[PDB]
Design a protein around this ligand. Structure first.
Ligand code: 696
Ligand code: NA
Lengths: 251, 36, 11
């Protein structure tokens, strides 16, 4: 996260870390949506251009963390994966369209003051909150510049008007993506960066006080460059796929 | 899990559940065009 | 840079 601050303890209890076993390294961010399911970006698991194709057995999910490199004994939980489901139409060849994946944990995790699931939006919440100018929050242990943080970082970014998003790149934007960030002319900065992929973009409903995950960190061209924005997967538009694998393969 | 969803989702043990606000959530709420 | 995690989680 660039130009963000350290998070507070228990500020994002749904934040997850996808950790590789060998080498033992942070791979991506992810989020907890129930006691047995994690949501992340499909490119974190499959990206053939760079020969990336991970299997259950190669990953570990660390939940309840704050510190990036320490094993937070008695606070975090490490789970193994039972199954990984990538969106059948994830487009890694052209623009990472439908960059979403679900991971089923081997065993359910128990919630605590540091482990709690985020809500997935419903048509109405998406409708009222995904408006240009409204700010959302992104969290992650990714790069600070285009070193790394010791603690989870957070930054609040405004959603941008879709034309502005399309006119900032040469990549074809789809309705399954939205972009966020400040305009060169807004004197504020911030963006996600390498290592933040897969993590959550959330908003707090002023109607019922709950936090909803509206997006997943997907891509950007550089980090916090002026005139560019970060792109996020539109969770609500892919929710029927989510519903389907969950009630087709578990809960 | 699904819509509205999980049940107790989105209510943080250390904040909403105790009626405590984190330091920048107001920035979010203030951008959703005010609350009156 | 990461700290070692308990062997039981690799196995
Ligand atoms: N500026 C942004 N908004 C942004 C957001 C997410 C990102 N993820 C990355 C990223 C860069 C290199 C490799 C991966 C990657 C590739 C395959 C598997 C896992 C991560 C990234 O997610 C950069 C990147 C930049
Ligand atoms: Na920018």
């Amino acid at each position: 996260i660039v130009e963000g601050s350290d998070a507070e303890i228990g500020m994002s209890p749904w934040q997850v870390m996808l950790f590789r076993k060998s080498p033992q390294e942070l791979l991506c961010g992810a989020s907890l949506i129930s006691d047995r399911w994690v949501l992340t970006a499909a490119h974190c698991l499959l990206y053939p251009p760079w020969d990336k194709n991970f299997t259950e057995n190669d990953l570990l999910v660390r939940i309840g963390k704050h510190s990036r490199t320490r094993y937070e004994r008695n606070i975090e939980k490490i789970s193994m994966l039972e199954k990984i489901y990538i969106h059948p139409r994830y487009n890694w060849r052209e623009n990472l369209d439908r960059d979403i994946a679900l991971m089923k944990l081997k065993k359910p995790v128990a919630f605590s003051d540091y482990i709690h699931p985020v809500c997935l939006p419903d048509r109405e919440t998406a409708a009222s909150l995904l408006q240009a100018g409204y700010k959302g929050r992104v969290t992650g242990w990714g790069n600070l510049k285009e070193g790394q943080p010791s603690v989870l970082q957070v930054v609040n970014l405004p959603i941008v008007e879709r034309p502005v998003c399309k006119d900032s790149t040469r990549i074809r934007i789809t309705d399954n993506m939205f972009c966020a960030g400040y305009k060169p002319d807004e004197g504020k900065r911030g963006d996600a960066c390498e290592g933040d992929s897969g993590g959550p973009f959330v908003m707090k409903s002023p109607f019922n006080n709950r936090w909803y995950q509206m997006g997943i960190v997907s891509w950007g061209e550089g980090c916090d460059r002026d005139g560019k924005y970060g792109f996020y997967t539109h969770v609500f538009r892919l929710k029927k796929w989510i519903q389907k694998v969950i009630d087709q393969f578990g809960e | 899990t699904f819509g509205s969803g999980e049940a107790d989702c989105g209510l943080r043990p250390l904040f909403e559940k105790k009626s405590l606000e984190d330091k920048t959530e107001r920035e979010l709420l203030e951008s959703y065009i005010d609350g009156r | 840079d990461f700290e070692e995690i308990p062997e039981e989680y690799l196995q």
